[PDB]
Design a binder for this molecule. Structure first.
Ligand SMILES: O=c1ccn([C@@H]2O[C@H](COP(=O)(O)OP(=O)(O)OP(=O)(O)O)[C@@H](O)[C@H]2O)c(=O)[nH]1
Ligand SMILES: [Mg+2]
Ligand SMILES: [Mg+2]
Ligand SMILES: [Zn+2]
Ligand SMILES: [Zn+2]
Lengths: 928, 182, 73, 186
RNA sequence: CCCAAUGUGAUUUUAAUAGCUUCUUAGGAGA
RNA sequence: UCUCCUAAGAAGCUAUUAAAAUCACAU
């Protein structure tokens, strides 16, 4: 009855057609995301709201719209407080309406504050739903994508609609949010100007802005000098940052007068320096960010300043034309003839860089200068034909020859004598648990360019910087165990010199030729030049010929010798220290033999309470990896150079690594293409940079798991204080807190124990904490790889194990078994039987098909097959005995052919030990 | 000289062994013989040591001589490449983009777009042909181009009359189109 | 074991087509490669024996490339 | 054993053992032990030369075998692969593979890749009426253990031939080899 | 023609050092 | 005279390590 008089008062003096969203005089209840920091709780988490009565508008013909009136019951003082603040901030067009009124309930007067024509959801609900994505709980994201016309409600019936790789059209559906978010950004700058000119102080948070962009809830602000108004924004912009690239928000900056209905800006084609445009973009959206921005990173103060300033450059470099980036070239005279050569670079992340040792006139060239000119793509690209290659979406520069090259892949050779032998022993019968699954797959001439096009999956990715600048200090604690620094050419170790030197030297010789042609002072002079100048280089793409279970091709990057020779002299002292250490998190350099597998597992199990095992593998690790995370990996490895390199030397080396193995002119099929980002697998640090990236995503998942947990539900006061201190160090302190970084590293290392080797990891973790949200679980990795790696991680690629007596399901493609060996039990590795039988049946050369030439090839495969003898499945245990029976046959035939050929017996009768188990058992027992 | 002492002492001892004149004097001749043999073993061992060091000296010199020949061969090969590429740059078309620049410096990626006399277009299907290369002249990179030749993936020449929706299943895609700036 | 005999025969058959210079015809090699790679991934013998009849028909169509009347005796 | 020095070593150790067993005086045993030590040392020096020279031969046989046999495997590769393929195709014993191989021996070779989908087009060469008599019946053709519908028939001069003209008596008037074009029946 | 970075294991060959054994030479000690 | 110890040279064996070539596996 009486509720009608309340409904008529909530309309006010306005024309409105309201309907009640619940019971007529009591409050409504909703679950929403909030950025909160208080004496009792801190985090970015989802909480119940109960202090509001909701009404919704109908239109002029009886249908509902996204326009709500949200009334709230307040105390008396705060009601007046918010009123005072609003009146001063009332004429801002960025502020929502605030109706302060009173009304009788339960027989007495209560004040109310009505906010008019708000959306259903806030900016915090859009930010939370894209960070914390779960494919089984998408109902808030689905309602935002439909309420604002991003897609029809029928779009969600598609197979894998959310997956960036299987449904790449989702990148067009998320980009329809771009103008909505960019209007909210503008309205924040109008509101900050109003707070400053009105003399108001306060923190502004994503939960207090609607999805049109309007601000409300002024009850926590205070008054000051009218010219001393100051808005706090560190958590607002940092939580929002990864959504700005995902929704392509600044895409309206490419158009005339920045209107999506007008044509594109026709930029001057010769223009390479955009420094004043980058500064104009920063004041347009980030005016109150309160930290110095350097458009060109040669001006930065330290690693942390380089990460700060490069994160804004990945946003702004999406406005400028693709032809503006890459080498900057100048005309120079050598013995009177004019060369064209590189005298700088323009980076999407690092800005413009100019070389310090440029000479405009030269009389003669040394061997060191001929190498730099030869490596420089300038002369190769400036003298080649123009290329329009429609087989790919990657940017094509020039064709170096009048013909295109097409490279095919041929099938593997069939070793019929081993297959006929196996079939005689009862192998390959129908319904058997062991069968052929590994083969050599043939490919057509489009093979190469088809594998190179997977670099499409590398999208520009802005990070949360407040989060990344804490994670980078915890990731570094995993590398305090090792020494590092520069070395002379006298001390560099090379594994094999009979390998390709790259382009364009693969036409004159192999790495050995250059290493023999250059004295140690030509090599040290070439290294010292890179600390003051950028050398850009060409990279080949080479197809791979090897056995596989899946039919896709594989390509590897043939990195040039100017790059390979000098990167090896900067990093090798550290990379040799990582491989010499035992018992650490990174397990590069540790053998599986003589007990080493049992030692690695007893180390990851550590002293974890209620422990559980889990693991994962990155999909397209090299393709997807963001440039911000490949830059951070090189900065973490370079921290060892504090004693021998200045701030300026450590920059050019970074710039070099960016110019040579991140952004590159790749040569493929005799033609040049611009690589968009990510790893190149012939890079001297490949396995070691993958391992730093893999720790970073696993540290990030634990920051997100703890800050998204409700702090009122945590029972242990130690973990409430850990969550509270973590929010301050992340989003309110601006310098590193060494005492907390050590405490979070110690917490993490007890409750969440890792073993890591490139893009492969095993974790042993406290399940009681993981089920309460106090440490990461597989849902916290699915979420992080979605907003920070642009990949959907399928549950078909993950695992978890409850019983530690079974060990990890798979690490390095090897299964584990607990077996008795002597007086005690040990963990042993075992391969997939089809990988070992497939390698015997199919080979990559014709001479490998005669077993009498190749007896030692079967001895090596029997060393990997030995642990199968201890398996409960007899069809697996028989695979080792097949190899031992074959090794005997090959020696009987070799002896027969040798006697028929020479009429004299062989004197080396020692072959008899290779067909007995004692030679192989000794490979898996300790004490060598 | 130690070998001569050993050989002459052997003859002096061997005559006394033949007649067994006296064990005492045999020892005297024998001690002088085995002392000479000890000096001979020292000299012969050193001769064998020096003979092995001579091969180590010559083989190190051949590794130095082969390393200087290979330096001298690749130095003139790198110069032959650089001074060859230099005789292709459009020295008039190129001077006009470099002279227009603010500071005489330009992106590399605009040099082929603005100065190259020739274009290669690689086309994967007939829908892409019809949209990009239809007819005999076409526009790309804000310039006009004329088609001089088309070839298929097998490098066989294709006439422009053969590229149609009906005949497209018979051609070896991709086609490569060569055009000149006009 | 025909499942495995068919998969092994497919590897030998494409090796014979590759040695007869079929790679010198991009329009024909791209079909032999697809038939070969499908027979290896197959799980039903009826699919694999139908794709084996298509792949073997390439070799039989090349008149005079192999002396089939001598290879069958 | 049987080296030149072995007789001196063997007789010296026999004499040394005989003297200690007989209880002879220690100065005689010292002379026997010393003459044994030098004969033994010369035998060991001869045996060290033998074992080094035998390794020199055993490496030469082994590496010469690998060289001469790697040449043999790489030379006859075209004749080995073709012989291997036609050995494996017999073991499969599939009716369609047997049917097309038996037809190809007589010259009844296809011009297309044999298609798998219904109503797709096949073209086959027919060498003589004695082939036609076995493969064809009315409008139907039987090949790769499937039925096909004859669409058209063509002479060596590219002239069309009607299905009523193909008979034993009229066969000398056609320009063989004939071509039959057909479509896969359901 | 093209054929990357890095780790681990097996096999063969060569080089350096340690121990053992025999002869020769030299010096001292005991008898 | 005889024995032992010490010092040197030669012969031989064993052990360890290093280096070179080769094969196999892992990302
Ligand atoms: O031969 C190799 C293999 C791998 N790698 C390096 O190891 C990384 C992981 O190698 P993986 O074997 O995990 O493959 P992948 O992730 O590239 O592909 P998926 O099967 O997961 O789709 C690659 O991204 C590359 O950087 C090499 O450098 N060389
Ligand atoms: Mg992976
Ligand atoms: Mg794994
Ligand atoms: Zn900066
Ligand atoms: Zn340094």
């Amino acid at each position: 009855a009486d509720a009608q008089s309340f409904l008529n008062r909530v309309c006010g003096v306005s024309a409105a057609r309201l309907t009640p969203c619940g019971t007529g005089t009591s409050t409504d209840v909703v679950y929403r995301a909030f950025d909160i920091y208080n004496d009792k709780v801190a985090g970015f988490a989802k909480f119940l709201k109960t202090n509001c009565c909701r009404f919704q508008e109908k239109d002029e013909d009886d249908n509902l719209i996204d326009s709500y009136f949200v009334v709230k019951r307040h105390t008396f003082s705060n009601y007046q407080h918010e009123e005072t603040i609003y009146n001063l901030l009332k004429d801002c067009p960025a502020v929502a309406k605030h109706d302060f009124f009173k009304f009788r309930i339960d027989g007495d007067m209560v004040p109310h504050i009505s906010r008019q024509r708000l959306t259903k959801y806030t900016m915090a609900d859009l930010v939370y739903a894209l960070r914390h994505f779960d494919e089984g709980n998408c109902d808030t994201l689905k309602e935002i994508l439909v309420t604002y016309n991003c897609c029809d409600d029928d779009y969600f019936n598609k197979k894998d609609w959310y997956d960036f790789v299987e449904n790449p059209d989702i990148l067009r559906v998320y980009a329809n949010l771009g103008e909505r978010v960019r209007q909210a950004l503008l309205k924040t700058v109008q509101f900050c100007d109003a707070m400053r000119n009105a003399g108001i102080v306060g923190v502004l948070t994503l939960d207090n802005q609607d999805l049109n962009g309007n601000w409300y809830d002024f009850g926590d602000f205070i008054q000051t000098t009218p010219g001393s108004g100051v808005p706090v924004v560190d958590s607002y912009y940092s939580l929002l940052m990864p959504i700005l690239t995902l929704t392509r928000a600044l895409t309206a900056e490419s158009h005339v007068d920045t209107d999506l209905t007008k044509p594109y800006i026709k930029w001057d084609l010769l223009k390479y320096d955009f420094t004043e445009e980058r500064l104009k973009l920063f004041d347009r959206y980030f005016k109150y960010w309160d930290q110095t921005y350097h458009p060109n990173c040669v001006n930065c103060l330290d690693d942390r300043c380089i990460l700060h300033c490069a994160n804004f450059n990945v946003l702004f470099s999406t406005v400028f034309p693709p032809t503006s980036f890459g080498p900057l070239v100048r005309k120079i005279f050598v013995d009177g003839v004019p060369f064209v050569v590189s005298t700088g670079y323009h980076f999407r992340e690092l800005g413009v860089v100019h070389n310090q040792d440029v000479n405009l006139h030269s009389s003669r060239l040394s061997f060191k200068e001929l190498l730099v000119y030869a490596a420089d793509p300038a002369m190769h690209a400036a003298s080649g034909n123009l290329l329009l290659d429609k087989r790919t979406t990657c940017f094509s520069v020039a064709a170096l020859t009048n013909n295109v090259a097409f490279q095919t892949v041929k099938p593997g050779n069939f070793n019929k004598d081993f297959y006929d032998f196996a079939v005689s022993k009862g192998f390959f019968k129908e319904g058997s648990s062991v069968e052929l699954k590994h083969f050599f797959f043939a490919q057509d001439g489009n093979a190469a360019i088809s594998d190179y096009d997977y670099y499409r999956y590398n999208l520009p990715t802005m990070c949360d910087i407040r989060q990344l600048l804490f994670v980078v200090e915890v990731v570094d604690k995993y590398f305090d165990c090792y020494d590092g620094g520069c070395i002379n050419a006298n001390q560099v170790i090379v594994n094999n010199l009979d390998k390709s030197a790259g382009f364009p030297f693969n036409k004159w010789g192999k790495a050995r030729l250059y290493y023999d042609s250059m004295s140690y002072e030509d090599q040290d002079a070439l290294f010292a030049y890179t600390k003051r100048n950028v050398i850009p280089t060409i990279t080949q793409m080479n197809l791979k010929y090897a056995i596989s279970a899946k039919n896709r091709a594989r390509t590897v990057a043939g990195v040039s010798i100017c790059s390979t020779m000098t990167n090896r002299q900067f990093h090798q002292k550290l990379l040799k220290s990582i491989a010499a250490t035992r018992g650490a998190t990174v397990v590069i350099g540790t053998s599986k033999f003589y007990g080493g597998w049992h030692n690695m597992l007893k180390t990851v199990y550590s002293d974890v309470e209620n422990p559980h095992l889990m693991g994962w593998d990155y999909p397209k690790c090299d393709r997807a990896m963001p440039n911000m995370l490949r830059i951070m990996a090189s900065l973490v490895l370079a921290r060892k150079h504090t004693t021998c390199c200045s701030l300026s030397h450590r920059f050019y080396r970074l710039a070099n690594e960016c110019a040579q193995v991140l952004s590159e002119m790749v040569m493929c099929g005799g033609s040049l293409y611009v690589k968009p980002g990510g790893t190149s697998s012939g890079d001297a640090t490949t396995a070691y940079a993958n391992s730093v990236f893999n720790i970073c995503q696993a540290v990030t998942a634990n920051v997100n798991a703890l800050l998204s947990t409700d702090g009122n539900k945590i029972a242990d006061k130690y973990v409430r204080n850990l969550q509270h201190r973590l929010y301050e160090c992340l989003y309110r302190n601006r310098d590193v807190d060494t005492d907390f970084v050590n405490e979070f590293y110690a917490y993490l290392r007890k409750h969440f124990s890792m073993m890591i080797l490139s893009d492969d990891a095993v974790v042993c973790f406290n399940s009681t904490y993981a089920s309460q949200g106090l440490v990461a679980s597989i849902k916290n990795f699915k979420s992080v790889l979605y907003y920070q790696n642009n990949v959907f991680m399928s549950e078909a690629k993950c695992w978890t194990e409850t019983d530690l007596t079974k060990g990890p399901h798979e690490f390095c493609s090897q299964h584990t078994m607990l077996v008795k060996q002597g007086d005690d039990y040990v963990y042993l590795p075992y391969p997939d039987p089809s990988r070992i039988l497939g390698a015997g049946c199919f080979v990559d050369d014709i001479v490998k098909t005669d077993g009498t030439l190749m007896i030692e090839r079967f001895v090596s495969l029997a060393i990997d097959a030995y642990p199968l003898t201890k398996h409960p499945n007899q069809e697996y245990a028989d695979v080792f005995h097949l190899y031992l029976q074959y090794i005997r046959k090959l020696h009987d035939e070799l002896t027969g052919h040798m006697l028929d050929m020479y009429s004299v017996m062989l004197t080396n009768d020692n072959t008899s030990r290779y067909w007995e188990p004692e030679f192989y058992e000794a490979m898996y027992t300790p004490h060598t | 000289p130690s070998y001569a002492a050993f050989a002459t002492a052997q003859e002096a001892y061997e005559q006394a062994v033949a007649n067994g004149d006296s064990e005492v004097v045999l020892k005297k001749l024998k001690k002088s013989l085995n002392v000479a043999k000890s000096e001979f073993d020292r000299d012969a061992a050193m001769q064998r040591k020096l003979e092995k060091m001579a091969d180590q000296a010559m083989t190190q010199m051949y590794k130095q001589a082969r390393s200087e020949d290979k330096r001298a061969k690749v130095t003139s090969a790198m110069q032959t490449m650089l001074f060859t590429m230099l005789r292709k740059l459009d020295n008039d078309a190129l001077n006009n983009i470099i002279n227009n620049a603010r500071d005489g410096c330009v992106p590399l990626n605009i040099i082929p777009l603005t100065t190259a006399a020739k274009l290669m277009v690689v086309i994967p299907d007939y829908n892409t042909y019809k949209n990009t290369c239809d007819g005999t002249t076409f526009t790309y990179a804000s310039a006009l181009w004329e088609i001089q030749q088309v070839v298929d993936a097998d490098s066989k020449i294709v006439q422009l009359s053969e590229i149609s929706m009906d005949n497209s299943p018979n051609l070896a895609w991709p086609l490569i189109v060569t055009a000149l700036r006009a | 074991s025909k499942m495995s005999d068919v998969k092994c025969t497919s590897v030998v058959l494409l090796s014979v087509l590759q040695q007869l210079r079929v790679e010198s015809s991009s329009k024909l090699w791209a079909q032999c490669v697809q038939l070969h790679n499908d027979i290896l991934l197959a799980k039903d013998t009826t699919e694999a024996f139908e794709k084996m009849v298509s792949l073997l028909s390439v070799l039989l169509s090349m008149q005079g490339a192999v002396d089939i009347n001598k290879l069958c005796e």
